[PDB]
Amino acid sequence: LTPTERKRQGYIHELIVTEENYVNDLQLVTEIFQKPLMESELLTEKEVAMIFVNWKELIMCNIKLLKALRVRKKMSGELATTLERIEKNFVITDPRLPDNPIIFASDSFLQLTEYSREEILGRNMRFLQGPETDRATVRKIRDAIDNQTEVTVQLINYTKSGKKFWNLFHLQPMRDQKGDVQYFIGVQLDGTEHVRDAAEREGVMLIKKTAENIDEAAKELKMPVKMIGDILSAQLPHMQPYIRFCSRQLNGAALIQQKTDEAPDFKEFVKRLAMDPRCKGMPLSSFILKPMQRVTRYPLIIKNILENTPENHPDHSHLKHALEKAEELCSQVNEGVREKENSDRLEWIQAHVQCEGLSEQLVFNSVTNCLGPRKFLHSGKLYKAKSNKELYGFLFNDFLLLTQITVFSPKSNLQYKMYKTPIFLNEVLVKLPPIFHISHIDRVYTLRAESINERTAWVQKIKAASELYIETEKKK
């Protein structure tokens, strides 16, 4: 197969494999961090929500994505568990990608070489080699790869600290139906001395049998993929919850750090939850950064697939739209991160304005229907004329919310009850007769501001945001 078509499959599976690991990490935090902390009675219901936020919603998005990938790949969820049951030292590499990167490494291997998964994935396996390593033995391994054949040799490798150990290494290519090599299997039998005769014969049989079990486990993964863009193009516009989480990931991380330095009982309970072998000795404050890393990873992956996809290919069109949506999703995420002050205000409104009786729950710190990330514009007291009913209004870029007090200060706690249905700015006109009038098609609202300078602030901001809404809706 051509290197272009070859790199294509490597990048499509780069998307699938990394997604498996990512979704797996999301389910871990919910399993061994979220639920335990909720039932520990160490933190209040409010403090927990300030950290995880919409973590549950993040999983609901990627699961729908991952499941769709699995059906197309004809996979089951068993691959991860099936590989873990093989308690042997081995890795899997992808020759379709430059310098033959490592895409998987067993727990036994990581503990043997004292390396972590993050330090290994994406890099070539040659890091094990050192000064006392037979460079002639190494060449035999390279030739086996170039000829796409199996080989079994013995050489000296080094750990992370630099510990020497003999390596009864076995190489074996993984092939599909057409005999095309998709991956390489590398089994390592560590030892202190060079094995000969019976000692060598027994070791070879074990590492070869191990290689066969791995080939059986990764059987569904070996098969090539025809199309993948149509799936990405259908799921990416539904990655909305990321924008809220990434806008609050900074405050959520600072909450954990602050709570640790003021509560020793909390610090101990967290590290005892990081006791998990699937955590790989990695703290909770690090899993929070993963969603931000993942959304910025998509445009890099999709582009690699797109560049290795010809124009006449039926998947080329879907990858184009997928790349656009991935970048639009990434852009809106970065905007939420930058607009820090706007993020805190929307979340404050969420926890102080009781909105009930709607067809769908109202999330202020979220995405609008057409204008993207919601933005707070103006607030203040508003008196409805001919009634003089004291109401407090919140102006957003897409709608205006009228409430009733039962401002953005962290300590002061006022509770706002929802007054009427949120009036969207796509159907309202504003004119002047501190009294101002807004023109809804069905009914006419007559409100009075706190002062003259306030009315001019209301009229201008409502009008400017209304015209921005209309012209945006006229684009499509």
Ligand X SMILES: Cc1cc2nc3c(=O)[nH]c(=O)nc-3n(C[C@H](O)[C@H](O)[C@H](O)COP(=O)(O)O)c2cc1C
Q: Which stretch binds ligand X (CB under 6 A): 137-145, 195-203, 208-216, 399-407?
A: 137-145
**CB closer to ligand X, 166 vs 266:** 166
Those residues with Cβ within 8 angstroms of residue 367's Cβ, 6 or more apart along the chain or in another chain: 240, 243, 332, 373, 374
Q: What is the dihedral of CA 161, 164, 168, 170, to 10 degrees?
A: 40
**CB closer to ligand X, 145 vs 204:** 145
Site string for ligand X, 155-184 (x = CB under 6 A): x-x---------x-x-x------------x
436 binds ligand X (CB under 6 A): no
d(Cα 120, Cα 123) in Å, to the nearest integer? 6
Neighbours of 179 (CB within 10 A): 8
431 binds ligand X (CB under 6 A): no
128 binds ligand X (CB under 6 A): yes
Asked whether the CA dihedral 137, 143, 144, 145 is positive or negative, the reply is positive
125 binds ligand X (CB under 6 A): yes
**CB closer to ligand X, 13 vs 294:** 13
126 binds ligand X (CB under 6 A): yes
**CB closer to ligand X, 183 vs 245:** 183
Nearest distance, CB of residue 137 and ligand X, angstroms: 8
Those residues with Cβ within 8 angstroms of residue 271's Cβ, 6 or more apart along the chain or in another chain: 283
Q: Which stretch binds ligand X (CB under 6 A): 34-42, 121-129, 228-236, 238-246?
A: 121-129
Token digits of residue 326: 């991935």
**CB closer to ligand X, 184 vs 376:** 184
Nearest distance, CB of residue 114 and ligand X, angstroms: 14
Token digits of residue 84: 């873990």
Cβ atoms of 64 and 96 closer than 8 Å:
no
86 binds ligand X (CB under 6 A): no
Distances (CA, A) of 152 to 93, 158, 192: 17, 18, 18
Residue nearest to ligand X according to CB distances in the complex:
186
Side-chain-side CA neighbours of 218 within 13 Å: the count stands at 27
Those residues with Cβ within 8 angstroms of residue 67's Cβ, 6 or more apart along the chain or in another chain: none
Q: Which of 9, 34, 54, 129 binds ligand X (CB under 6 A)?
A: 129
**CB closer to ligand X, 22 vs 166:** 166
Q: Which of 53, 75, 106, 186 binds ligand X (CB under 6 A)?
A: 186
Size of the site for ligand X (CB under 6 A): 21
Nearest distance, CB of residue 130 and ligand X, angstroms: 9
Reference 93, options 131, 125, 126; nearest CA is 125
**CB closer to ligand X, 29 vs 171:** 171
Burial 356-388 (b: 16+ CB within 10 A, else e): eeeeeebbbbbbbeebbbbbbbbbbebbeeeee
Nearest distance, CB of residue 127 and ligand X, angstroms: 8
Distances (CA, A) of 376 to 128, 316, 449, 464: 55, 39, 18, 13
Nearest distance, CB of residue 142 and ligand X, angstroms: 4
Token digits of residue 363: 């999330």
Q: Which stretch binds ligand X (CB under 6 A): 20-28, 120-128, 220-228, 361-369?
A: 120-128
Q: What is the dihedral of CA 450, 453, 454, 456, to 10 degrees?
A: 130
142 binds ligand X (CB under 6 A): yes
468 binds ligand X (CB under 6 A): no
**Interface residue list for ligand X (CB under 6 A):** 91, 93, 100, 124-126, 128-129, 138, 141-142, 145, 155, 157, 167, 169, 171, 184-186, 188
